[PDB]
Structures are given as C-alpha cells and as structure tokens.
Amino acid sequence: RVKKVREMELIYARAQLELEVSKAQQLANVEAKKFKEMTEALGPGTIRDLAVAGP
Amino acid sequence: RVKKVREMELIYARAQLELEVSKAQQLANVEAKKFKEMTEALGPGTIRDLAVAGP
Numbered sequence: 001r002v003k004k005v006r007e008m009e010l011i012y013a014r015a016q017l018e019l020e021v022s023k024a025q026q027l028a029n030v031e032a033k034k035f036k037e038m039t040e041a042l043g044p045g046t047i048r049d050l051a052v053a054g055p
Numbered sequence: 056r057v058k059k060v061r062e063m064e065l066i067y068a069r070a071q072l073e074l075e076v077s078k079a080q081q082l083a084n085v086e087a088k089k090f091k092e093m094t095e096a097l098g099p100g101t102i103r104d105l106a107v108a109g110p
Contacts, residue, residue: 005057012061019068026076030083037087041094042102050106 039047094102 008058008061012065015065016068019065019072022072023075026072027079030076030079034083034087038090041087041090043099046099046103046106049103053107053109055110 042050097105
C-alpha cells in the first residue's frame with residue numbers, strides 16, 4: 001500500500017523537479033539576457049563611470 | 056486514481072511553465088528593447104555625464 005504511494009509520489013516529484021528547474025532556468029535566461037541588453041545599452045566605460053560616480 | 060490526476064496536472068504544469076517563461080521572455084525583450092532605445096537616444100558620453108553629474 002505505502003510503496004505504491006511512495007513510488008507514485010516519487011515519479012511525480014521527479015517531474016515536479018523538472019517544473020521547478022525549468023522555472024528557474026527560463027526565468028534566469030530572461031534575467032541574464034535583460035542584463036545583457038541593459039549593460040550593452042550603456043557601454044563598458046559608461047557603466048563603470050556610473051557605478052563609480054564619486055570624487 | 057491519483058496517478059492520472061498527477062499525470063494530468065503534470066502536463067498542465069509543463070504548459071503552464073511555457074506560459075510563465077513566455078511571459079518573462081517577451082516582457083523582458085520589450086524591457087531590453089526599450090532600454091536599447093532609451094540609452095541610444097541620449098548617447099554614450101551623454102549618459103555617462105548624466106550618471107556622473109557631480110563635482
């Protein structure tokens with residue numbers, strides 16, 4: 001009785017893991033690509049000057 | 056009984072994942088393209104001067 005429930009929940013958890021990792025995966029690809037476009041929009045020296053804007 | 060429900064919810068979650076990642080995807084492409092046009096409108100040195108406007 002319990003082993004079938006444990007086995008069934010096991011394969012569900014494996015696929016639920018694929019749901020979780022894909023959520024982390026794609027939400028980070030867009031997070032990284034947006035950062036790619038954000039920092040490319042400004043410029044290498046420009047972002048450095050903006051971050052170190054202080055005398 | 057449970058396995059069919061778990062399997063059915065699994066494929067729904069897979070497609071719901073595609074809904075979530077597409078939402079993150081396209082909302083970031085517009086976020087990045089708008090930033091592309093925003094920083095291109097000002098200029099490379101101009102944005103640096105605006106961000107480091109301090110003596």
